[PDB]
């Protein structure tokens, strides 16, 4: 499945940085699609195409000559417009559907104790939930079958940068005789929830 | 600006001086691939993705040529207004729960990078280390600055203290993020 790219238009005739990008905003699959290209010089977007407007618009004064010229040439304006179909819709239905949109990586779930156990003394359990994809996830702590919300803290979603995520969930607790603590994880890659238990 | 998914199907970045270019695809904040502009190959972040999908690197190389040309034009057009340096910030975290004795990976996440020229290095007990080191490409941010991650393979030990060292034009002295 071949991906296709946005095509940068040619600008009209101590450090400098230029950036160009084509962004495809998908909502409910390809039912709603919005397409925006951006042209950026030293952090300032100066011209852009937006499928909601249907033509290039200058964003600042620097972009005036480009937007007018690009819009005036049918070959340039039509090729940019067509990118909503030929890039966004095409990439989603082809390559994305068989790669990104199908990736399902199961969380490793492990329970750790912060300090050495001592009955009737305060301590912390950490539920480490790691290496999962995609991002949607639910983690909950239970003590003896009842949901705990007090003394519970989760990190934000941690993006590893290698197409997996991580979330660590701490529970401040005091281990007594016979109580069992359970970390409960639900994720689209799991037919049924993962439950891991730590017996006091 | 709201969506279930965002594909960035072509990010082109060019810098002067130095003729420094980068070409990448992102989907929902992760890198699909970059195009290696010297070897002229598409390099997928996940090798399994590259077995199912493909991209012709010439699509990236021609985009880089346009953007090289546009930079020259926009530089003159703006009276050679130069880029303003930012101060990057680092965060250091392990990939897996740390267990003494067991191989793991330290990740240094560096944000607010602009311009996207940076040196990210690792210190173990203040001495240079580079085991299994890998860096991502520069990722785009909404404010047109960048972020980037570096990885270091390491064996956790209480006798070992780590630093992520970041050097950038927007920093008077190198910043060390301790872990």
């Amino acid at each position, epitope marked *: 499945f071949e991906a*296709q790219k946005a095509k940068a238009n040619k600008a009209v005739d101590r450090h400098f940085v230029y950036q160009f990008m084509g962004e495809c905003y998908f909502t409910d699959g390809t039912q709603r699609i919005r397409y925006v290209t951006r042209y950026i010089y030293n952090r300032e977007e100066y011209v852009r195409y937006d499928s909601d407007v249907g033509e290039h618009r200058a964003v600042t004064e620097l972009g005036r000559p480009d937007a007018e010229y690009w819009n005036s040439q049918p070959e340039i304006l039509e090729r940019t417009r067509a990118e909503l179909d*030929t890039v966004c819709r095409h990439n989603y239905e082809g390559p994305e559907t068989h790669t990104s949109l199908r990736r399902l990586e199961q969380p490793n779930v492990v329970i750790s104790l912060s300090r050495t156990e001592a009955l009737n003394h305060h301590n912390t359990l950490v539920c480490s939930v790691t290496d999962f994809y995609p991002a949607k996830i639910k983690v909950r702590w239970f003590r003896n079958g009842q949901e705990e919300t007090v003394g519970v803290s989760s990190t934000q979603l941690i993006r590893n940068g290698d197409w997996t995520f991580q979330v660590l969930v701490m529970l401040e607790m005091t281990p007594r005789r016979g109580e069992v603590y359970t970390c409960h994880v639900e994720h689209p890659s799991l037919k049924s929830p993962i439950t891991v238990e730590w017996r006091a | 600006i709201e969506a279930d998914h965002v594909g960035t199907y072509g990010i082109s970045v060019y810098q002067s001086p130095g003729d420094i270019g980068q070409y990448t695809f992102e989907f929902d904040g992760d890198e699909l691939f970059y195009v290696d502009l010297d070897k002229k190959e598409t390099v997928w972040m996940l090798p399994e993705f590259g077995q199912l999908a493909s991209f012709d690197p010439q699509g990236g190389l021609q985009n880089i*040529a346009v953007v090289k040309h546009n930079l020259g034009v926009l530089t003159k057009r703006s009276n050679s207004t130069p880029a303003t340096n930012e101060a990057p910030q680092a965060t250091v975290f392990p990939k897996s729960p740390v267990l003494l004795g067991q191989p793991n990976t330290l990740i240094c996440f560096v944000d607010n990078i602009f311009p996207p020229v940076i040196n990210i290095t690792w210190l173990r007990n203040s001495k240079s280390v580079a085991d299994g080191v890998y860096e991502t490409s520069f990722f785009v941010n909404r404010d047109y600055s960048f972020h980037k991650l570096s990885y270091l393979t390491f064996i956790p030990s209480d006798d070992d203290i780590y630093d992520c060292k970041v050097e950038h034009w927007g920093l008077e002295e190198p910043v060390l993020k301790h872990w």
Partner: T-cell receptor
Amino acid sequence: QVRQSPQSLTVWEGETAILNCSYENSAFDYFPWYQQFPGEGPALLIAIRSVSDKKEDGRFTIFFNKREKKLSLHITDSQPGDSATYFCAASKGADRLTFGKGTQLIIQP
Amino acid sequence: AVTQSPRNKVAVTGGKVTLSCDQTNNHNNMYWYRQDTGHGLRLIHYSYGAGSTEKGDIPDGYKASRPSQEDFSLILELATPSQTSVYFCASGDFWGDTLYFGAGTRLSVLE
């Protein structure tokens, strides 16, 4: 691969000349025909995008069949001045072309 | 316009041949092709701008040079008889729907 047939075609003046082309790669989305007279370089004659099944311009028409990955250039009311070599080419993503081997057309008076 | 130079040339095997092409179209992309009966228009090398070149379908035996936006040269360092052909240069815009060809260069490489 872009394949043209026949390699050489002779047609009577006034008859419709039919030049066939086919391709392998289904991503191909742009199909320009180039006309080359003896001793000169080729020049773009007429072109079609995979979204259309027909492109007409004067005496020249392209008929395009995406499913079969087949393509045809019809020249109506052919004139001795139409004698030339005709090249079919294809593009994807507006990257570079790949030319067919060309079909030589001779119009007999 | 796209001008090729020279238009005809006889060379000896082992000889060095340079074919030069100049365009005044303000185009960014330039291309070098050969044409031979039974092979059609085969792309040898191309270029998106000064200082860079890209391989075509049949780059072997050929080096390309783009010293400026206007000029694109094809260099045959060790000419062989199989490089006997008619060569065409073309220029076009970024992503261009249209190539603009020169008039051709007849090259004979003789033992």
